[PDB]
Amino acid sequence: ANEVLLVVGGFGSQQSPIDVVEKYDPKTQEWSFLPSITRKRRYVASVSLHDRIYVIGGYDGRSRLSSVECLDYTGVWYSVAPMNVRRGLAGATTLGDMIYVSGGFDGSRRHTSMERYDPNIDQWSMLGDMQTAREGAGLVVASGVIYCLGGYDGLNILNSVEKYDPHTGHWTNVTPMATKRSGAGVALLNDHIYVVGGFDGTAHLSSVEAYNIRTDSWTTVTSMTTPRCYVGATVLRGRLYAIAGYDGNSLLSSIECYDPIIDSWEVVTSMGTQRCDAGVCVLRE
Amino acid sequence: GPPGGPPV
Ligand code: NA
Numbered sequence: 001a002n003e004v005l006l007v008v009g010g011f012g013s014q015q016s017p018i019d020v021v022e023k024y025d026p027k028t029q030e031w032s033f034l035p036s037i038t039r040k041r042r043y044v045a046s047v048s049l050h051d052r053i054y055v056i057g058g059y060d061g062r063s064r065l066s067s068v069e070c071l072d073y074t075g076v077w078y079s080v081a082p083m084n085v086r087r088g089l090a091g092a093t094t095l096g097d098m099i100y101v102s103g104g105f106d107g108s109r110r111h112t113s114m115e116r117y118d119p120n121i122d123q124w125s126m127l128g129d130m131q132t133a134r135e136g137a138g139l140v141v142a143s144g145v146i147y148c149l150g151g152y153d154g155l156n157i158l159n160s161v162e163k164y165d166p167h168t169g170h171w172t173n174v175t176p177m178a179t180k181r182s183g184a185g186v187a188l189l190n191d192h193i194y195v196v197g198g199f200d201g202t203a204h205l206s207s208v209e210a211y212n213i214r215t216d217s218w219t220t221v222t223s224m225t226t227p228r229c230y231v232g233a234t235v236l237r238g239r240l241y242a243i244a245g246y247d248g249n250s251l252l253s254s255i256e257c258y259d260p261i262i263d264s265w266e267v268v269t270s271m272g273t274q275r276c277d278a279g280v281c282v283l284r285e
Numbered sequence: 286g287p288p289g290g291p292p293v
Contacts, residue, residue, distance in 0.1 A: 015293060043287075089287055105287075136287055152288055182288055199289025229289045246291055276291070 002027065003236050003282050005255070007243060008055050009037060009044040010278025011230075013251055017042035017061055020273050023283070024255065026236055031271055035075045041065060043088030046279025047099055048073075049119070054080075055279060056101055057087040064088045064107050068117070073283055081122045084115050089183075089277065091139035091148055095166070100127075102148055102164075103134035110135050110154050114164070130162050130171050136230075138186030140193055142213060147174065149195055152182040157201045161211075175216050177209055183277070185233025189240050190260065194221065196242050197228040204229050204248035208258070224265050225256050232280030241268075246276040 005024040012018040019041070021034040037055055044058030053071045057064070064086040069077045087104030090111075094100070102114035110133035115126045130148060137151030137158070146164040148171075150157070157180040162171050177195060184198025184205075193211040197204075204227035209218050224242055231245030231252075240258040242265075244251070251274035256265045286293070 011291070015291070157288060183290075201288065204289060230287075246289070248289070251291070 002285050004285055005234060005236060005241060005243065006046065006048070006053065006281050006283050007232065007272060008046045008279040009041045009058060010244070010275035011042040011251070013274045016040070017059065018273070018275060020275070022272055024269065024272065026241070026257070026268060029269060031269070035071070035077060038069055038077050043277045044279045045090050045092035045101060046281045047092055047094050048281040048283055049094045049097065049099065051284065053281065053283070054099060054117070056092055056099070057083060057090055057104065059088040064105065081117070081124055083124050084126055085111060085113065087111065089135040091134070091137050093139040093141050093146060095141045095144065095146060100139060100146060102130065102139055103137050103151060105135040109133070110152070128169050128171060131173070132158065132160060132162070134158065136182035138184065140186050140188050142188050142191070142193065147193060149186050149193070150177060150181040150184055150198065156180070157182045157199065175218065178218055178220070179205070179207060179209070181205065183229040183231065185228070185231045185242055187233040187235045187240055189235045189238070194233070194240055196233050196240070197224060197231050197245065199229040203227070204246065222258070222263055222265060225267055226252065228252060230276040232278060234280050234282050236282060243280050244272060244275050244278060250274070251276055
């Protein structure tokens with residue numbers, strides 16, 4: 001019944017992409033290492049699904065990537081089928097028993113497209129396009145529907161939000177966020193979508209907003225302890241964790257935790273690898 | 286360089 005945090009890859013203090021994989025357990029507050037990924041990837045995404053960690057896309061310093069590798073967490077990494085497109089700073093989520101990845105950047109273009117991974121046939125299928133091309137936007141599932149949030153189209157940091165209805169296969173617009181953010185963290189918690197930090201085009205942000213789904217409205221939440229952009233976000237037993245990132249001067253090694261009980265953020269660790277644009281996901285143990 | 290990133 002006990003979940004843990006996972007952090008893969010990203011951009012490290014030696015200002016290169018890394019291959020470090022870390023586990024963080026919030027109950028003991030201990031860190032540990034898992035086996036490294038095969039290649040070093042910054043700008044990278046990660047999801048877990050049925051006790052399998054997938055590492056998706058990213059950028060190694062020479063090329064952006066379509067490759068994807070896998071680890072049965074119950075440890076050696078192995079390659080599975082590649083995406084149709086090379087994607088860094090892509091959004092990524094799971095729904096049903098599928099992976100969905102959307103947006104990103106191949107080295108020339110930002111993508112509107114979303115593709116989907118089926119572990120039963122080891123194949124990535126392309127789906128319908130978003131209206132806006134987005135890098136640095138997160139994907140989050142709520143009640144069987146996918147939301148893409150904020151990001152960057154090549155010219156503008158975005159406050160726009162789109163939702164994908166699997167019953168229709170179409171994207172539609174939702175009410176936008178109050179502030180434009182790229183590199184923000186996004187997670188679902190108690191039927192609200194939280195967006196934490198990111199970069200609005202001038203300032204690195206500590207600000208947090210929450211989308212009430214039942215009302216189609218956004219509200220300001222308590223700012224984090226420190227600005228963070230290109231930051232991971234995940235929910236673990238009813239609490240929202242902000243993970244590493246860039247504060248606009250330095251790479252963060254700390255995770256902070258938002259407890260709705262106190263409506264407040266607490267640093268729970270100062271000890272991970274400093275890094276940003278890494279992938280994060282939750283593991284059942 | 287994505288917006289708001291560190292120097293490289
Ligand atoms: Na509030």
